[PDB]
Amino acid sequence: RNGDLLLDHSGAYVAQYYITWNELSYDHQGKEVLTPKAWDRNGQDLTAHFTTSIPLKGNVRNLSVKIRECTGLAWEWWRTVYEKTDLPLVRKRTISIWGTTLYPQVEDKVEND
């Protein structure tokens, strides 16, 4: 079950993503293994306008998407703008964020029709 995770950041604030998942695999004895995987830009400070597409394989399990907005300097405050765990692996999911620092907004769009 191929899938794509599209992210769009148009908000007037610094955002951070934390996207992790497991890949299902079988060893030379053929029993189950879940391999932790993560987006390479996890924890990176991102500012508008930013877009990306993350390809997700059919053996992907335990998809977790965490989106935070940040503030402060040397040390940062954060509050969660979006957070879902064990997201259904669908054909195409688009998560878009926008708005202001004090009023961040988010849309999660699923397409698996």
Residue numbers in the entry: 359 to 471
What does the paper say about this structure?
The cholesterol-dependent cytolysin (CDC), pneumolysin is a virulence factor of the human pathogen Streptococcus pneumoniae (pneumococcus)2, the leading cause of bacterial pneumonia and a major agent of meningitis and septicaemia as well as debilitating diseases such as otitis media, septic arthritis, keratitis and sinusitis. A central feature of the toxin is the formation of transmembrane pores in cholesterol-containing membranes, which lyse or disrupt cell functioning, depending on the concentration. Pneumolysin and other CDCs bind to mammalian membranes through a tryptophan-rich loop and a threonine-leucine pair within a membrane-binding domain at the base of the toxin. Once bound to the membrane, monomers then oligomerise to form a pre-pore complex that subsequently undergoes a complex set of structural transitions to form a transmembrane pore, typically comprising 30–50 subunits.
Full-length pneumolysin and a truncated form comprising the membrane-binding domain (domain 4) were produced by expression in E. coli and purified by affinity and gel filtration chromatography. Crystal of the membrane-binding domain were grown at room temperature and contained two molecules in the asymmetric unit. By contrast, the loop is partially folded back in the structure of domain 4 alone, and fully bent back against the body of domain 4 in the previously determined structure of perfringolysin O12. Together the structures are consistent with previous suggestion that the loop springs outwards and downwards when the toxin binds to the membrane of a mammalian cell. In the crystal structure, Glu434 not only forms a salt bridge with Arg399 but also interacts with Arg437 that in turn forms part of the binding interface by packing against the adjacent monomer. Interestingly, these interactions are only possible when the tryptophan-rich loop is flipped outwards in the putative membrane-binding conformation. When the loop is folded back, as in the domain 4 structure or in the structure of perfringolysin O, Glu434 no longer contacts Arg399 or Arg437. In solution, Glu434 does not contact Arg437, so is unable to contribute towards monomer-monomer packing.
